[PDB]
Each structure stands twice: as C-alpha cells, then as structure tokens.
Amino acid sequence: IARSMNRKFHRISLGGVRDEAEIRGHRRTYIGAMPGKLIHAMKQVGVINPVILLDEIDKMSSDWRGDPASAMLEVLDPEQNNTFTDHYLDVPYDLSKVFFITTANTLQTIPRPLLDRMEVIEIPGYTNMEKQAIARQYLWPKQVRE
Amino acid sequence: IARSMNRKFHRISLGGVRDEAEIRGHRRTYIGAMPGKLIHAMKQVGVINPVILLDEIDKMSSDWRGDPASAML
Amino acid sequence: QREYYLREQMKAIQKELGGEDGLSDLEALRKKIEEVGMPEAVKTKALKELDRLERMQQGSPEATVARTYLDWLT
Amino acid sequence: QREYYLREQMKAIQKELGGEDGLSDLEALRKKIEEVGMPEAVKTKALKELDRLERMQQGSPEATVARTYLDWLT
Amino acid sequence: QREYYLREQMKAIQKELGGEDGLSDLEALRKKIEEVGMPEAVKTKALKELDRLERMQQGSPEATVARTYLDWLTEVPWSKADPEVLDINHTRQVLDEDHYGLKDVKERILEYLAVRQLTQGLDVRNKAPILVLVGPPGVGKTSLGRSIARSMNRKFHRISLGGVRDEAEIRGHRRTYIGAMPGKLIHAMKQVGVINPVILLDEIDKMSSDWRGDPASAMLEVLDPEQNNTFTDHYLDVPYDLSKVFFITTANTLQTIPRPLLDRMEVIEIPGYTNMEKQAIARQYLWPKQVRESGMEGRIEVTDAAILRVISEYTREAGVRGLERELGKIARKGAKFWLEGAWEGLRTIDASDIPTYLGIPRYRPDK
Amino acid sequence: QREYYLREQMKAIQKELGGEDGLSDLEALRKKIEEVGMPEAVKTKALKELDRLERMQQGSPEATVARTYLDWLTEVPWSKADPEVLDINHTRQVLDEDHYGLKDVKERILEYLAVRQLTQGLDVRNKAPILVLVGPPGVGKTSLGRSIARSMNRKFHRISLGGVRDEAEIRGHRRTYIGAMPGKLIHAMKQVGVINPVILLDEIDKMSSDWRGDPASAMLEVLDPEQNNTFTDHYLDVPYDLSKVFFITTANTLQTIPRPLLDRMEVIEIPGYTNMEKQAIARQYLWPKQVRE
Ligand SMILES: Nc1ncnc2c1ncn2[C@@H]1O[C@H](COP(=O)(O)OP(=O)(O)OP(O)(O)=S)[C@@H](O)[C@H]1O
Ligand SMILES: Nc1ncnc2c1ncn2[C@@H]1O[C@H](COP(=O)(O)OP(=O)(O)OP(O)(O)=S)[C@@H](O)[C@H]1O
C-alpha cells in the first residue's frame, strides 16, 4: 500500500513501552529524555503523509497504572489528533495527512471504545497449493540468493 | 440530551474495570500513579457541568482483586 | 583578569538581550493556579506543594512525583 | 541594527575568548526556523530557547536536556 | 588570598611543567586520536574538545572528566580484527577435543563459517542471527563459549547477568556526572583488542525489573542487527557498531525472556546427555582431571564397568556435575587409603569394589 | 637538581595540601600496591587509577570516591596464604571436642585435608569444597562452622541471608552513586586477612525470587565450581578470585532451593539424633554447661 501510493512505511508497535505516558513523550524535568515513540517514527521520515502500521495491537503494554487506551484514543479518533501534544513535544502537532494501519490477531483484548474506529479485515489462511505457489514464487529465491 | 441542554458530552465505557484503583487513584506512594476514570472524564471535558454516559455499569468485573461497585458509591 | 571580566561581558550582552520577562514554567504554574478556581483548602494545598517546588532545585525523583501531582491538580 | 550590534560584540567575545567559542551559537538555528516549518507556537517556545540559553556557554546539566528537546524540536 | 597567591605560584610551576613534562602525552593522545581507526564524526567530536583551560593540578572537576572521556574514546578498538578462519575442517579439528557429543551446535558453527566464507553478495553478512542456548542445568554451555572462541581463534569475554536490574550497566550514565561509568559493553570491548570478538551473555533468564523499567529495552537495542550499527551510549556520544560481534546467550527456559527479544533469536535445544555420552565424557575428560588435582596419578585406576555403576547408582541428573563429584570422592578416598599404608603398581577398581569407596548405593539399579 | 627543585616545589604543595596528601600517603599507596601481589591487569588498572587520582587534592568529591576505591582495592587480600598445617591426628582430636557424633562431616574434613598433603607442587588446581548441610532446626549446624574453622587453624566469618529480598547485597552498587559500597562478600573478605577463609552462608533456602527483588540468581557468580575465578562485583571493576574459599551453607528443605543452585553445591544430610546420641550429648556437653551457668 505504501509503494502503490508512493508512500513510506514504518513499523513501531505495541510492546515497547511501559505505559501510555511512554506512548507519549516525557517533559524536560527529567534527565533521561524519553521522547514520544510516535514522534520518533516521524523524525526518520521527511514526509508527513505515509502510513504507520500498528503490529500486534492486541499484545498490549498495560500495567496496574495505565492502560493503552487514552494515548491511543487521542491518535485514532479523527477529531483530537489535529492538535496533538506530547510531554516531549508540547506544541500543536497535526495528524490529518497520515493514514494509520492497525494490525491485530484477536479483537477480544481490544477495549470497547477503540472499536469505534476499527474496520475488520480478516485472513482466510493458506492452502498447501497456495503455500506451494508462495514458496516457489516468493520464498525460494530470497532464502537461496541470501 | 447534551444538545438540548447545550452542555458538553462525554462517555465513560465501564464493564472493563476490575479494581477500585481504576475508579479512585492508587496512592502517591506507588511509582507513576494516576487517578481514575471520572477524573479522566473531568480532565477531558472543560466545564464543571458536562453530561457523562456510563455504559455497562452492570458488568463491572468485581473479582478477587477488589470491588469497584463500592468505589462507585 | 580577562576570564572574570569577559564572562561578565557575556552576561552584559544577555541582560540586555533577554531583559525583563520573568518567563519560566514555575510562576506560570502559580499563575495557572491563581486564575481558575479554587476552593480554599485545595488552594492552600496547591500553594504548599508549589513552594515545596519553588525554593529548592530541579531534578530529584520525588519532585517528579510532586510535579505530576500538581499537574493533575491543575 | 541593535540586533546586529549586540551580536557583533557577542561574537567579538567569541573570536575574543576564542576557545573555541560562542558555541559559535544562536546565530545559526535562526535559519532553520522558517526553513523547517514552522507554525508560530514552536517559534514562541524555541525563540525562548535562544538567549536565556545564551546566559552562559558551559556544561551544562541544563544544556544537554534542552539540547535534546530543542534539536528534537528543529 | 594567601592561598590564591600560592596557587598562582603552583600553577606557574605547572605551566613550566606542562612545557617540561606535560608535553608529549596529551600531545601524544592528539597523535593517537588522529591515528588509525577513527571515523570522521569521531574525528569531529575529537576536534570538539581542543580549547583547554590548563589547571590540572589544583583540581579540577572540569579537567579530569574530559581527559577521562578522551581516554575512553581512544581506547575502544576502531577497525581492527584478527583474520578470518580459512579451514573449516580445522574447526572440526579444534571443536572435537573439548566435548564429546553436541552435534547441533558444532553444525551451526560450521554452517555460519561456510556462509560467511561463500557469500560474496549481501543480506547475510549483515544479518547473521544470534544463538540462544537452552538446556537443563549441568550440560555444557560456558565451556562451549570457550571452545567456540578458541575454535575460530577469536578473542573472548563473558558478561554475566542476573544480578543486574539497573539499566545503566548495559547503557551507562551521562558523562556530566561525578563517576564516569560506561556500561558493561564498553568494558567488554576494551578488554579484547579486536573489534570482532565473541561475547557470552550469561543468563538472560534472570534480568529482574524495577523502577525506571528493566534493562531489557537496552537488550532490545543491542540484540537487533538493524539499529546497533548506530548504537550510541549515554556515556559515549559517538555511534558505535555492535554488528559483527558474535553473541551467544544461555538460558534454562524461554518464558522469562522478554517477547521483544524473541524476534531476533535462534534457539538451540540441548536435550541432555545419555549413559554412553556420560561414560565417554567421564573417561576422556572427567577422570584425568579428577585424578590430576588429587595427586593419585598412576596409583589408582577405574574400569569401564565401574563408571557405569557410578552413573546408574550414584547420580540422577541431566548433567555431569554429580558424576564429577562422585568421581572426586573416589579420588579422595584413594588418597586417604594411600597414607594408611602404600601398595605397589596401581590398585584397579572394578565395578564391585565401589561401595568401599562410595558407601551405600542410593538409586536402585533397573533390573 | 632541577627535578629536585621541581618536585621539591611539590613537597611544598603537599605541605599546603594537608601537610600530607600530595605525595605522602599517595606514595604509601604506591607501596601497598607494589606490596601483596595482584594480577597484572588489576595492578596496572590500579596504577592508572592512582595516576588519575595523584595530581589532584581536596576536591573534587571524585577524588574522595577514587580514594575509597583505592582503599577498598588495596586492602582486600591478594595472595595472603593461610599455612596448611597438615596433621590429621591433632585435628581429629580437636574436632572430637566440640561435637559428638557427626561422622560424615569429620570424615570429609579428614579426606579434604589428607588430599592437601599430596599436592605435587604445581599441576594441581587446588579447589576448595562447597558444602551444603541439610537438617532439622535443632541439630547443630551453625555451631559446626566455627568448630571446623578452628580445627584447621583458619579464619571464620558469618553471613546471614535470612530474609533478604534485597538484591545488591550480594553484589554492590556501582561506584558512581553517592553512598557506594561493595557487597557483603567482598566486605567479608576484607575483614578477614587471608584468602583461605571459612565463609558460613547461613540461611540460603530462605531468600526471595520475584520480578523485583531476586537475590538468589546473583548467587551464580559466587557458588561457581569453575568460573568463580572471574567474579565481578559492581563496586570493584576487577575480577576477584574466590576459588580457595571453603564455603559452608545451611538449609532446612531441598524443595525451596533454585535448580541452578543445588547442582552448584554438595549435599550432606544430617539425620537428627537418637536416644543414645542425645544421652551422650546430654551427659558430656549439656548438663555441665547448664550446671555452670
Ligand atoms: N560433553 C561435555 N564434554 C566435556 N565437558 C563437559 C561436557 N558437558 C559438560 N561438561 C563440563 O561440565 C561442566 C558444566 O559447565 P556449564 O556449561 O557451566 O554447566 P551449565 O549447565 O551451563 O551450568 P548453568 O547453571 O546452566 S550456566 C563444565 O566443566 C563442562 O566442561
Ligand atoms: N552433637 C552435638 N554435640 C554437641 N553440641 C551439639 C550437638 N548438636 C547440637 N549441639 C548444640 O546445640 C545447639 C544448636 O545450635 P545451632 O548449630 O545453631 O543449631 P542449628 O540447627 O544450626 O539452628 P538452625 O535452625 O539449623 S539455623 C548449639 O549449642 C550446639 O552446640
């Protein structure tokens, strides 16, 4: 979808933070300046259009303090994201040219309000004929020429 | 109702809560604590008089950890 | 002699350039306290924690907890 | 003109206190303000990261955290 | 005021000294920071520090940490390695005189040497996976670390984890503090002289977490070969490259290893040893060491039925330490019997003369 | 004569430093470094640490931290022998005084001392045992440690690990902190003067294992039958040698000890006592003491 729409592609997904405060940034009051994870993906691109894939959103990063809901609800809703603010950003940031991709395996651990925006794309599996065709076309030249 | 009264609207979706620490806070003596859902809603509304919808207060996961129904009292 | 003099020449430059503002985050927090609200006991609690942040330094890990406490209060 | 002249004598301290100096500084991210972006509010915060930064040119325990935040912001 | 004057006297003497002895060491580091190895950005950060303030006797807190950072930056190895191995049959000549058995690990080493030799394209010299050894306690893991490092004839250093719960032993602290403390990796790289060593990371099962998180995020930052090419520190301010370093990690189970580390892993299950394998290692490695330390060399000898008695009736483990101590007890009992009156030649221990030396057989034999 | 003038000016420097403190006990530190034999990497590391510490005085606090580093490093013993007195009838009669019965452990000490006569100069490894004593609470185990350490004319030290969930008691905090301090074990080696002591780790089956507060996995670098020639604490940045140490640990139940620690240690079980044993223990150990007191 990135190369068809002439866009970039970045991964960065759930499982790398301790709370949604680490989904956001951290203020300069600390010594260890932990940036917002999002902005760090935006730093490595010189384009504010492309997609951002959310691999394994059901594999959360929760704790007894903080569920991964509020920092996700303020970036997935198409309303409050137009003026976005991190603790390591503290300025009006704009999310209207991006088109996010979310990847999951099970909808059951996803909370109820964040299902307001999700659109269900499911996977049928693969036939052994389909896997034989995949392994001829697409896996054998990579793993052999590597 | 929010439009007819001309006030702010907000939605808290309960049913997923499991302890009293997601309705109240925890304590300041635990690293990184925060207050509960009602304080989140008051943070995200702007006035003293919004309306707050409470979806599925009848399905709150009161369990071996605690009972947030008493926290709701 | 030149060291002590010329760094004062540096601060000369700065005291003309910056001037007069009183612009930081601390008295901004105090102003944000004194604008909205407040009930009386809540106000005195916030002023105690504000002074507890004021006369000392910036960097201790309990000051981060008190900072998050005041930021959740405002 | 007053800008030119105050920065004249500031970088006269630079070539004067010439190790190395100045951090040759804050004449220079002045060009990536309008180049990299920017809206007005980022300009309000980061132009209040020029001269009260210029207050000294040593260390710092402040210049590293403000360095990371500002060079993140630019 | 008197102290300020006499400190003037002292530092006057010093600047004649920094003429007299105080040339040709910082000058010699300015040579050696511009000698072979250093990248261009590292040369720029080396040119950053050239404005000195010259008060190195009466203090100074801003004079000694810059010298410390300069020494740490100039002592880590920059672009130097002992050459590649040419014969992979000789790799089998070396790996087989340390361990009986362990086919799979030797095969993976030979495969990695064959792939590194035969590739002249790309996509595998950059991406070579990290071995994760998993096995029950008692099988050989650390001795494999030494045997692999001597097999390829590379240098070696071993980092033990498990007592580490702080992040600043993998990363370090900021260089503006009092104690200049880079992480364990900068120590492990200045120990070896080459830029391509073998590093054994002991016990990634046991990195406990605490406040300010766990150092498992730093482990993600070091055990993924797509960002450690630009691996920077909190102490160092240059991008170092931990790409070619052949990491080997040991473990006892995979659950307590974090899931951000089970993406750039490659598990190898060591199932345990069997009775013939234990008997072969028992002879050819455990017995002459357990007799050479005990001083009873050429005065006592164990048979091969007797090792089978010791294995089947005096140890139940998936490893070889219980067998090691059970042989050591025989060596000590013989060393005690020698002082009560010597014999001639060497007494030989058949499988029936064990319980004189080892008491009651604990585990019944399977009949 | 000009270097005489020059380092004489430095004599005057330390005359104003503390009357001392610039080449007085700094050079006493050079003596005690080139006293008792350190390994050469550790020795040159201590020499460059002394070289970075030498030419400053009285500030900064980094001078104080490095002074305490060279006070720890040059006082923990390096090559401080304990003379193995090799009589096996004297030591048998000394072990027979403090305890009755206990045939297994006394036979073990006689075996592990009869071996140490027949050391054929070099070519041996000289590795000390690592015992674990397992028994019910009343049976004398902690009493036996000082008895064994006195019979062999060695030294003795205790470490109680009774309820520690505190990691970095075993290892230390790294020296960049404020109140930095080594572990329990390097301090236990510091108080003893020799490198052949008898360390009694008291309650090793009562510790903690949790996602925060797991000290039992930090006992891997210590109770190590091969690789404890490379022990790495966090305060000292050098490998310290713990092979010569006659460790004795006690426990109560094997069911609560971690699996990478049972195989590091050598189990010796103590099977309570019987009525004849208790009666003899009573008559010649318990009743005279309770009559005296
Ligand atoms: N097949 C073998 N050949 C030779 N020596 C062996 C063999 N298997 C084990 N050993 C020896 O047995 C001892 C076990 O070494 P380690 O690998 O440290 O044991 P370990 O199981 O790794 O301990 P942990 O707790 O899992 S780190 C060493 O002395 C090895 O040399
Ligand atoms: N066989 C014995 N002969 C003489 N005194 C003994 C004997 N067995 C035990 N004692 C004495 O009984 C007491 C037992 O003390 P401890 O050694 O502390 O017992 P302990 O079992 O080590 O305690 P715990 O619960 O195991 S830590 C001491 O006063 C010993 O001297």
mmCIF file of C-alpha atoms in Angstrom, chain A:
data_model
loop_
_atom_site.group_PDB
_atom_site.id
_atom_site.type_symbol
_atom_site.label_atom_id
_atom_site.label_comp_id
_atom_site.label_asym_id
_atom_site.label_seq_id
_atom_site.Cartn_x
_atom_site.Cartn_y
_atom_site.Cartn_z
ATOM 1 C CA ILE A 1 0.000 0.000 0.000
ATOM 2 C CA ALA A 2 2.962 2.324 0.629
ATOM 3 C CA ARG A 3 4.700 1.664 -2.700
ATOM 4 C CA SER A 4 1.383 1.726 -4.587
ATOM 5 C CA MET A 5 0.505 5.110 -3.066
ATOM 6 C CA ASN A 6 4.178 6.236 -3.309
ATOM 7 C CA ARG A 7 4.392 6.386 0.498
ATOM 8 C CA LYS A 8 6.883 5.350 3.164
ATOM 9 C CA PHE A 9 6.337 2.577 5.714
ATOM 10 C CA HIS A 10 7.288 2.374 9.388
ATOM 11 C CA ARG A 11 6.554 -0.371 11.910
ATOM 12 C CA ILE A 12 6.923 0.529 15.626
ATOM 13 C CA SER A 13 4.217 -1.231 17.587
ATOM 14 C CA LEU A 14 2.666 -2.257 20.916
ATOM 15 C CA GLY A 15 5.055 -3.963 23.371
ATOM 16 C CA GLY A 16 7.910 -1.413 23.577
ATOM 17 C CA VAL A 17 6.588 0.906 26.326
ATOM 18 C CA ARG A 18 5.593 0.663 29.994
ATOM 19 C CA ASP A 19 2.522 2.932 29.943
ATOM 20 C CA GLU A 20 0.721 5.391 27.704
ATOM 21 C CA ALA A 21 2.953 8.083 29.199
ATOM 22 C CA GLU A 22 5.714 6.304 27.276
ATOM 23 C CA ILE A 23 3.456 6.208 24.223
ATOM 24 C CA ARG A 24 3.586 9.968 24.717
ATOM 25 C CA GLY A 25 6.865 11.721 25.461
ATOM 26 C CA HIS A 26 8.313 12.972 28.718
ATOM 27 C CA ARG A 27 8.920 16.516 29.899
ATOM 28 C CA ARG A 28 12.392 18.061 30.188
ATOM 29 C CA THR A 29 12.130 17.960 34.011
ATOM 30 C CA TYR A 30 13.727 14.500 33.892
ATOM 31 C CA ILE A 31 17.314 13.701 32.962
ATOM 32 C CA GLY A 32 16.510 10.724 30.769
ATOM 33 C CA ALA A 33 14.583 12.435 27.992
ATOM 34 C CA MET A 34 12.295 9.679 26.695
ATOM 35 C CA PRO A 35 10.610 11.032 23.523
ATOM 36 C CA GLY A 36 7.124 10.104 22.437
ATOM 37 C CA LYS A 37 7.512 6.875 20.469
ATOM 38 C CA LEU A 38 5.311 8.250 17.650
ATOM 39 C CA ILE A 39 7.332 11.352 17.019
ATOM 40 C CA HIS A 40 10.495 9.244 16.649
ATOM 41 C CA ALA A 41 8.984 7.456 13.656
ATOM 42 C CA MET A 42 8.038 10.869 12.257
ATOM 43 C CA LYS A 43 11.647 12.014 12.676
ATOM 44 C CA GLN A 44 13.051 9.334 10.356
ATOM 45 C CA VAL A 45 10.670 10.386 7.549
ATOM 46 C CA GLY A 46 10.725 13.714 5.735
ATOM 47 C CA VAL A 47 7.098 13.195 4.679
ATOM 48 C CA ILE A 48 4.020 13.735 6.872
ATOM 49 C CA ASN A 49 1.756 11.668 4.578
ATOM 50 C CA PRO A 50 2.663 7.960 4.862
ATOM 51 C CA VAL A 51 1.190 5.018 6.700
ATOM 52 C CA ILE A 52 2.130 3.801 10.183
ATOM 53 C CA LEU A 53 1.442 0.118 10.854
ATOM 54 C CA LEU A 54 0.439 -0.935 14.382
ATOM 55 C CA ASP A 55 1.703 -4.523 14.626
ATOM 56 C CA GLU A 56 0.023 -6.678 17.322
ATOM 57 C CA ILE A 57 -2.194 -4.072 18.948
ATOM 58 C CA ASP A 58 -3.843 -6.848 20.972
ATOM 59 C CA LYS A 59 -0.442 -7.591 22.558
ATOM 60 C CA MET A 60 -0.701 -4.578 24.839
ATOM 61 C CA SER A 61 1.778 -2.871 27.180
ATOM 62 C CA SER A 62 -0.518 -2.284 30.143
ATOM 63 C CA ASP A 63 0.264 -2.161 33.863
ATOM 64 C CA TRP A 64 -1.603 -1.542 37.125
ATOM 65 C CA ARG A 65 -1.069 2.105 36.270
ATOM 66 C CA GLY A 66 -2.226 2.905 32.771
ATOM 67 C CA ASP A 67 -3.994 1.034 30.044
ATOM 68 C CA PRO A 68 -3.021 1.712 26.396
ATOM 69 C CA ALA A 69 -6.309 3.489 25.675
ATOM 70 C CA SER A 70 -6.103 7.275 26.156
ATOM 71 C CA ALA A 71 -2.917 7.974 24.182
ATOM 72 C CA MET A 72 -4.385 5.645 21.527
ATOM 73 C CA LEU A 73 -7.829 7.284 21.624
ATOM 74 C CA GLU A 74 -6.220 10.710 21.099
ATOM 75 C CA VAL A 75 -4.394 9.473 17.980
ATOM 76 C CA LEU A 76 -7.021 7.153 16.435
ATOM 77 C CA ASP A 77 -10.022 9.492 16.698
ATOM 78 C CA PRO A 78 -10.198 11.816 13.660
ATOM 79 C CA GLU A 79 -11.016 14.814 15.888
ATOM 80 C CA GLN A 80 -8.475 15.448 18.660
ATOM 81 C CA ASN A 81 -5.486 14.379 16.548
ATOM 82 C CA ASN A 82 -5.477 17.648 14.576
ATOM 83 C CA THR A 83 -3.744 19.420 17.510
ATOM 84 C CA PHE A 84 -1.709 16.665 19.180
ATOM 85 C CA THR A 85 0.590 17.214 22.162
ATOM 86 C CA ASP A 86 3.239 15.074 23.843
ATOM 87 C CA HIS A 87 5.183 15.826 27.000
ATOM 88 C CA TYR A 88 8.350 15.725 24.887
ATOM 89 C CA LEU A 89 6.704 17.863 22.208
ATOM 90 C CA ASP A 90 4.464 20.468 23.976
ATOM 91 C CA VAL A 91 3.467 22.120 20.662
ATOM 92 C CA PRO A 92 0.431 21.710 18.369
ATOM 93 C CA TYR A 93 1.164 18.687 16.175
ATOM 94 C CA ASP A 94 -1.046 17.833 13.212
ATOM 95 C CA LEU A 95 -2.366 14.352 12.313
ATOM 96 C CA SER A 96 -4.510 14.786 9.207
ATOM 97 C CA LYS A 97 -2.249 13.713 6.320
ATOM 98 C CA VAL A 98 -1.365 10.315 7.806
ATOM 99 C CA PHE A 99 -3.391 7.146 7.257
ATOM 100 C CA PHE A 100 -2.786 4.665 10.057
ATOM 101 C CA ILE A 101 -2.723 0.877 9.758
ATOM 102 C CA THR A 102 -3.576 -1.294 12.753
ATOM 103 C CA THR A 103 -2.639 -4.982 12.961
ATOM 104 C CA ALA A 104 -4.159 -7.437 15.433
ATOM 105 C CA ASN A 105 -4.670 -11.160 15.912
ATOM 106 C CA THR A 106 -7.579 -11.132 18.373
ATOM 107 C CA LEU A 107 -10.213 -8.432 18.855
ATOM 108 C CA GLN A 108 -11.151 -9.702 22.326
ATOM 109 C CA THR A 109 -8.427 -7.886 24.285
ATOM 110 C CA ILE A 110 -9.121 -4.668 22.364
ATOM 111 C CA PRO A 111 -11.271 -2.359 24.541
ATOM 112 C CA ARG A 112 -14.787 -1.294 23.614
ATOM 113 C CA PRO A 113 -14.281 2.457 22.799
ATOM 114 C CA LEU A 114 -11.304 1.928 20.467
ATOM 115 C CA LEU A 115 -13.519 -0.378 18.376
ATOM 116 C CA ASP A 116 -15.433 2.731 17.261
ATOM 117 C CA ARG A 117 -12.847 3.304 14.529
ATOM 118 C CA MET A 118 -11.612 -0.188 13.622
ATOM 119 C CA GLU A 119 -12.664 -1.821 10.362
ATOM 120 C CA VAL A 120 -12.383 -5.599 10.329
ATOM 121 C CA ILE A 121 -10.039 -7.185 7.760
ATOM 122 C CA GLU A 122 -9.679 -10.930 8.378
ATOM 123 C CA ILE A 123 -7.389 -13.583 6.903
ATOM 124 C CA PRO A 124 -8.624 -16.839 5.300
ATOM 125 C CA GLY A 125 -5.388 -18.819 5.730
ATOM 126 C CA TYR A 126 -3.345 -20.614 3.077
ATOM 127 C CA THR A 127 -3.851 -23.759 1.016
ATOM 128 C CA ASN A 128 -0.951 -26.174 0.655
ATOM 129 C CA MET A 129 -1.328 -25.426 -3.043
ATOM 130 C CA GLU A 130 -1.262 -21.745 -2.117
ATOM 131 C CA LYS A 131 1.736 -22.368 0.116
ATOM 132 C CA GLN A 132 3.475 -24.280 -2.662
ATOM 133 C CA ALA A 133 2.878 -21.381 -5.049
ATOM 134 C CA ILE A 134 4.119 -18.900 -2.425
ATOM 135 C CA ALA A 135 7.201 -20.987 -1.718
ATOM 136 C CA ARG A 136 8.027 -21.198 -5.403
ATOM 137 C CA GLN A 137 7.416 -17.568 -6.342
ATOM 138 C CA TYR A 138 8.355 -15.682 -3.232
ATOM 139 C CA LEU A 139 10.386 -17.588 -0.625
ATOM 140 C CA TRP A 140 12.843 -19.790 -2.503
ATOM 141 C CA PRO A 141 14.755 -17.009 -4.393
ATOM 142 C CA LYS A 142 15.181 -14.874 -1.258
ATOM 143 C CA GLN A 143 16.336 -17.695 1.019
ATOM 144 C CA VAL A 144 18.581 -19.156 -1.676
ATOM 145 C CA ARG A 145 20.202 -15.978 -3.030
ATOM 146 C CA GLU A 146 20.711 -14.675 0.512
#
